[PDB]
C-alpha cells in the first residue's frame, strides 16, 4: 500500500460497469441516453448551442470498454455530465427531464457503495 494506487481498466470495468448496466436496465428511462444526441435527427437543432460537452451512455461504455478512464471519479464525472446536460437542455415538464431524474436516482443508489469499496 506504500505505492501509488493504480486502477487497471479491468478493475474499473468490473466495479463500474454494473452501475452503468443499472442505468441501461431502466426502460424507457434510459432510452434518451443510450446514444449521442443527434440534434438534426431529433428535431432539436440548437442543442449544441446549449450543450458544449455532450455525453451519453454509449460513450461512457466505450470509455470503460477501451480503458480511457484512469480513476473511478472520472467515470462518475461523465455520468453526472450526461445528467446535467439533459437537465440544462430539457424543461421540467418534458419526459426526457423526468427520465433523467429517475436515472440520477438509480445512479446515486448504485454508485455510493461501489466507490466506498473501490478505495
Ligand X SMILES: CCOc1ccc(C(C)=O)cc1Nc1cc(C(=O)OC)cc(C(=O)OC)c1
8 Cβ contact partners less than 8 Å away, ≥ 6 residues apart: none
Nearer of residues 35 and 74 to ligand X, judged by Cβ: 35
Taking CB under 6 A as the criterion, the residue among 12, 90, 107, 111 binding ligand X is 90
Q: Does 69 bind ligand X (CB under 6 A)?
A: no
Cβ 16 vs Cβ 114: under 8 Å: yes
* Rounded distance between C-alpha atoms, residue 104 and residue 82, angstroms: 10
- Provide the 3-class DSSP secondary structure of residue 91: coil
In whole angstroms, what is the distance from residue 91 CA to residue 1 CA?
A: 48
Site string for ligand X, 93-112 (x = CB under 6 A): --xx----------------
**Region 6-45 residues binding ligand X, contact defined as CB under 6 A:** 28, 31-33, 35, 37, 42, 44
Q: Which of 7, 69, 83, 89 binds ligand X (CB under 6 A)?
A: 89
Contact 30, 84 (CB under 8 A): no
Q: Which is nearer to ligand X, 12 or 86 (CB)?
A: 86
Greatest Cα-to-Cα distance within the chain, rounded to the nearest angstrom: 54
- Residue 16 or 37: the one with the smaller Cβ distance to ligand X is 37
Residues that bind ligand X (CB under 6 A): 28, 31-33, 35, 37, 42, 44, 86, 89-90, 95-96
Amino acid at each position: 500500500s506504500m505505492r501509488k494506487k493504480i486502477f487497471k481498466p479491468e478493475e474499473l470495468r468490473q466495479a463500474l460497469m454494473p452501475t452503468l448496466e443499472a442505468l441501461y436496465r431502466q426502460d424507457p428511462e434510459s432510452l434518451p441516453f443510450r446514444q449521442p444526441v443527434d440534434p438534426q435527427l431529433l428535431g432539436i437543432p440548437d442543442y449544441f448551442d446549449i450543450v458544449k460537452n455532450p455525453m451519453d451512455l454509449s460513450t461512457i461504455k466505450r470509455k470503460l470498454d477501451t480503458g480511457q478512464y484512469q480513476e473511478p471519479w472520472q467515470y462518475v464525472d461523465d455520468v453526472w455530465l450526461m445528467f446535467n446536460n439533459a437537465w440544462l437542455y430539457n424543461r421540467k415538464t418534458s419526459r426526457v427531464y423526468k427520465f433523467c431524474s429517475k436515472l440520477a436516482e438509480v445512479f446515486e443508489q448504485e454508485i455510493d457503495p461501489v466507490m466506498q469499496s473501490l478505495g
